[PDB]
Amino acid sequence: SKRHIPVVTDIYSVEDHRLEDTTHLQYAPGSGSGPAVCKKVTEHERCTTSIMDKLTAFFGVMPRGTTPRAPVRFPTSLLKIRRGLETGWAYTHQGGISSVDHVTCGKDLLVCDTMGRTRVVCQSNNKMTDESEYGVKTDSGCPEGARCYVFNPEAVNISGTKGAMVHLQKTGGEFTCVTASGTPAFFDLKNLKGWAGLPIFEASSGRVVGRVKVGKNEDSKPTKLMSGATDLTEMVKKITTMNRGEFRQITLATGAGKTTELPRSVIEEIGRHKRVLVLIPLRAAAESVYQYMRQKHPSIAFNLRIGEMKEGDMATGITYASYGYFCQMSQPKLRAAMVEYSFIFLDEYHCATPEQLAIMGKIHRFSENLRVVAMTATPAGTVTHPIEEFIAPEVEYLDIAGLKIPVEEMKNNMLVFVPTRNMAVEAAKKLKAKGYNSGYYYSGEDPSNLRVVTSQSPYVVVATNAIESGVTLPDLDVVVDTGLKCEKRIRLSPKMPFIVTGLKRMAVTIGEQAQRRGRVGRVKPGRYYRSQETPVGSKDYHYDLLQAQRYGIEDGINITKSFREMNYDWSLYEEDSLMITQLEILNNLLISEELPMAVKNIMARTDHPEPIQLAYNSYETQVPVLFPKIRNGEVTDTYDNYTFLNARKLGDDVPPYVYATEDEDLAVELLGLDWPDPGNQGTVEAGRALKQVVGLSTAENALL
Amino acid sequence: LYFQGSKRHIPVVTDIYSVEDHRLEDTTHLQYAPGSGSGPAVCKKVTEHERCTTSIMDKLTAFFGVMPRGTTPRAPVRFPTSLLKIRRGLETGWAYTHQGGISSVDHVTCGKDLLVCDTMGRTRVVCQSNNKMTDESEYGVKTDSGCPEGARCYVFNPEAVNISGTKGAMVHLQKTGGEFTCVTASGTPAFFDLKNLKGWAGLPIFEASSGRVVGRVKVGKNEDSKPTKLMSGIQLTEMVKKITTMNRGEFRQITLATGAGKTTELPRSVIEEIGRHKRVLVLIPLRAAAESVYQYMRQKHPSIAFNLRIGEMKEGDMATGITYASYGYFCQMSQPKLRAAMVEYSFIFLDEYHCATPEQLAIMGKIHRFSENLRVVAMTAIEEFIAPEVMKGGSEYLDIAGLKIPVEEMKNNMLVFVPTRNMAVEAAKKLKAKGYNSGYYYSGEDPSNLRVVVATNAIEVVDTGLKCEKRIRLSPKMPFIVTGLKRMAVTIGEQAQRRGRVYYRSQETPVGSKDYHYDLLQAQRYGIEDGINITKSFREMNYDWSLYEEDSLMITQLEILNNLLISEELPMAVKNIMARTDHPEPIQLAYNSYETQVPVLFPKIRNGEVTDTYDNYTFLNARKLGDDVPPYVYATEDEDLAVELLGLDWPDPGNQGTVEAGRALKQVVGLSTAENALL
């Protein structure tokens, strides 16, 4: 059925005919007459396609003996086309004849006229736009909102005569069906079959502005005639039609302006005085987008919330805020502030910051009152100039972070990704001892100390996978990837201490390796030296979730439970069901009794890296304990003296910790000591619950 | 149509495997992939594999619950000795041919006629017998023979893959008790993941020596150390220790037989173990039940303090003993006040949750919002004749509510359970017209008129097996919610209450779980003031607590609509009207207020036609329907019917809130919200 030759059966010559009222001419579906430069049929010629010609054209073969024909050797007319069993139209214009692709299939028109057996050659065809050109396209543009119409010389109007027109109105890239008065009209699309290919004329000018291609009907919308960046407009439509209690996940390229232009479009669509919130992890990131946006769009108000909480904030523009900003609020205050925003955008959720998981769970508790849109350039479980890919061997040449690299590339700009900061500094000074322009970068460093090193023709910077951003490399040539990183991980066991948190060196993510290779090739081609380390798939957020539990202590909220329910509705993060269950039991223990005031103040004032430790352990021990530091796998006589703890050294008496670190567990093991067992109903029940959860016994009773 | 669940699918036979007996001394190579012996058996060898020619339209029609028109019936004997593969919607099962006809499993066929599009054309095998208690569906008479204990059996799947990797694999069995135990060809106890056995139900089980049928593949069972088995059905001090060792944030479900003291001695034991001055709450649906148990308990255990909370809200209650309360008592509280009150109790006992009253579901979801702060324990608890139904056609028997009862039993005191009240009065006057001492009872009756002398379930033996309860329909066409009374089968527990009274029951089969959708809809009211989505809270609650069976689709739809209900603040006038009216479902006013502020009185329906009478409810300030149908979001079956009979039409959504709500309901069930035709 894709073989059929289109055959012109009727030719309707037409002339411009201005009428101030077209009511009697409209096609059967508040104020206005519908004045237009109508089309009047002056002649109706029937083509004389013979029986065999018709059947041959039906079976895809052009009848033998048809001569070509110029698309100008026609009267200004509308041509009825019958392709196999289907019906459509084409029309004449200065450039020739033009029709629709799904009507003609880009095939030559069979025209058996008074000029004989002829065929019009198809010069252009476009299936995406559904246009077919037998000549050069001459359709002129149309101003937005102008009234148009499409004329069918074979339809029956309200008056019951031959020749009916459907009035239109140009909106966006499509046309809207309206009556002669201008009321939005509805048409059953079956009542419009056989109209494709007809031209759309502007009412005032009587000039072609488009073709009849596709009909579309929405539930509450009137009938439309479609004509087939632009994706962002659809995104904004979907966002703005949201009802309170709905949630959308959006995947946007960073350059497409997920943080910048998307909220701007939304707020311009719903109203400049409506309140829209945009949550960003890093304070500096929120500040940057705030300055950039308020200087770029001076017509739209903006607000930045990264410092003290502004009580009773009702700021009208777009509010760029940090998650941690709202972590300063009690649960009822958080809800009262969140429901006042027309829309809430959760930015860069793929990052698992504790403030982020806490705020996401906490607001999901009242998600029924919110319109929530989560944005990322890279969702959960998503990897992301030409480039040479090298695989460097482990250890003419030189040694860079344990990899064999040829000395030639030391003439070029090199970025070496190394797991730890001690390794970063070590390799840095080892490289400067050999006579190279080396530097180092890790968490907490100033992006300016590197200015001295990067402002030179040859430089070699050794940095952690941490802070890929701040270093801003100029004209970077080669990257050396050790394939390793250093992240915090947690272990959960039914034996107290139930929680053990520590740094671990581990393989890099596949997508994160792609990010390390992403650095070179932006302005100039480059090369990569990669280890034989194989990447591992996914991100672990468990340590960050554990830390996020803190923001629920004052409100008595189980942040782990809130996260589980949130992720159930929103599907934003990969889940380890077992680990989430255990963490939820432990979090239940964490809020089981009011935190002592002394522990509260110590937690608020200390430079301890994981003050939640004090909270978990406070169910067994009131006195924090300083374990001896572990240097090179043995026990030392040094201690991490943190502020406000009023601690004691370990000695030979191991405290009954609920929460410990890998170095504390190691100190206990090396000292030949043992961890105490649970000492109250809370910790005993928590331990037996964790043990029951890790039940290897599976049993099932399924009706096959 | 669209997605409406899984109980509508028509079963369709897709393949027919004609088979013959095939004696083998060794069957090892044929076994299915999971001490001494070869496993000699009368196997089944596939002689023909005919593929059915069910057309696309037939397949989709059967998928949407309708039987394709133009199919002729077919005897279950006009088949080769064969195994029939069945596809009901998306699921797969089996049936088999035998002397008595065709036999299959209930959860595979649902007691529906089999659509069989064979070389014989469009045919149907009629289901003669159906049994949900067992796993039997009969297209004919069951002819399965017995089996001696411990005999070796097997089940053959002509499509499974054996150890040799060919089509047709068998699982060896051995009859133990009323079930079968899985073993290998040698006889070693075997293990099977039940997923590796899904789609095997309906296959026959054969005895090894005789090669004769002894049973069907119905249910799989797996225990920790036990081997895989094939079931033929779906299948105090310790309690107190487990309850009292609970940490805040834990939940326990307890099943206790009545009289063992689910409400009395369990909470009494718990509070006696934890301390007589600790506060324990016990929530009971009925106020009179709570008051009664309060009186009984405070008279029985005078050493323990007791409190009753069924009336006005006692603010800041710190009553030390056991507090018996109605759920509705705590429905008077805002969410923060509810939390403040609930966290002060050491334990909270949810009694008789199987009722699922609106107050019950509302309180359960609302408190589950802060379950992490709570310790929650949910608790739940003459000869039998089957009388035949009577038709339009008797001489020494008599007809009671559509049942054939012998006149002899009329010499005894009879209680007739009847679904509707009109049936109660009708059968009452027919029975007194025949010369009997008859009466009637239903909700609102005088307790003395019956003293002087057929009743609705509201009386809580001749059991019709039916009741009259409100049911709801959810559609993407506004009005999205339609609620009306419907006659329906009784639950198992309620039939047990009707048999509890002194038995002639109809051929009506009971249903396992109560339908709570209407009560959930009504329960949404208790979250309007707090701005809480009771449906969402219920879904999360039941996810954590696993207390009620769930219709995922219905819950999702109800959650979308409930989100619409809380989208904007309720108008003050609507709040006051809802508080003062005798309208039976005031949540209607709240839903409709998103389109219409003026309630509409629809004409009443008497005997299926439109009347000129109206239900004049208080405080509505309504208008008569007339010829102008309001754009209702929430309607009733009689309102929808009145619209249909009057030849009128329901309006479409008229604002972005209702339009988007409709678009969400359509997005569920996979309905296109836009259409794009090439003109």
Author numbering:
A (entry chain A): 1 to 29, 38 to 236, 244 to 399, 405 to 415, 424 to 732
B (entry chain B): -4 to 29, 38 to 238, 247 to 392, 407 to 418, 422 to 481, 490 to 496, 506 to 547, 555 to 731
Paper passage:
The cleavages downstream of NS3, NS4A, NS4B and NS5A are catalyzed by the serine protease domain of NS3 which requires NS4A as cofactor for full proteolytic activity and is termed NS3-4A protease. Co-immunoprecipitation experiments have shown that NS4A forms a stable complex with NS3 (NS3/4A complex). In view of the critical role of the NS3/4A protein complex in the switch between RNA replication and virion assembly, the determination of the structure of a single-chain CSFV NS3 serine protease-NS4A complex provided the basis for structure-guided functional analyses.
We report here the crystal structure of a single chain construct encompassing full-length pestivirus NS3 in complex with NS4A residues 21–57. To express soluble CSFV NS4A37NS3 for crystallization, we used recombinant constructs encoding full-length NS3 (residues 1 to 683) followed by the 8 N-terminal residues of NS4A; the NS3 sequence is preceeded by residues 21 to 57 of the protease cofactor NS4A. Like in the crystals of the isolated NS3 helicase domain, the two molecules of NS4A37NS3 present in the asymmetric unit (AU) are related by a local 2-fold axis around the helicase domains in which D1 and D3 make a head-to-tail crystallographic dimer interaction. The overall shape of the pestiviral NS4A37NS3 is very similar to its counterparts from the Flavivirus and Hepacivirus genera with two separate globular domains, representing the protease and helicase, linked by a short flexible interdomain region that explains the different relative orientations of the two domains in our structures. The CSFV NS3pro domain, which comprises 192 residues, shares only 3% of sequence identity among the NS3 proteases within the Flaviviridae family. It has the canonical trypsin-like fold containing two β-barrels, with the conserved Asp-His-Ser catalytic triad located in a cleft between them. Like in hepaciviral- and flaviviral proteases, the pestiviral NS3 protease domain seems also to be stabilized by the insertion of a β-sheet from NS4A (residues 21 to 40). Interestingly, residue 132, a methionine in the closely related CSFV (valine in BVDV) and most other pestivirus strains is located on the NS3 protease surface and makes hydrophobic contacts mainly with L45 of the NS4A-kink region.
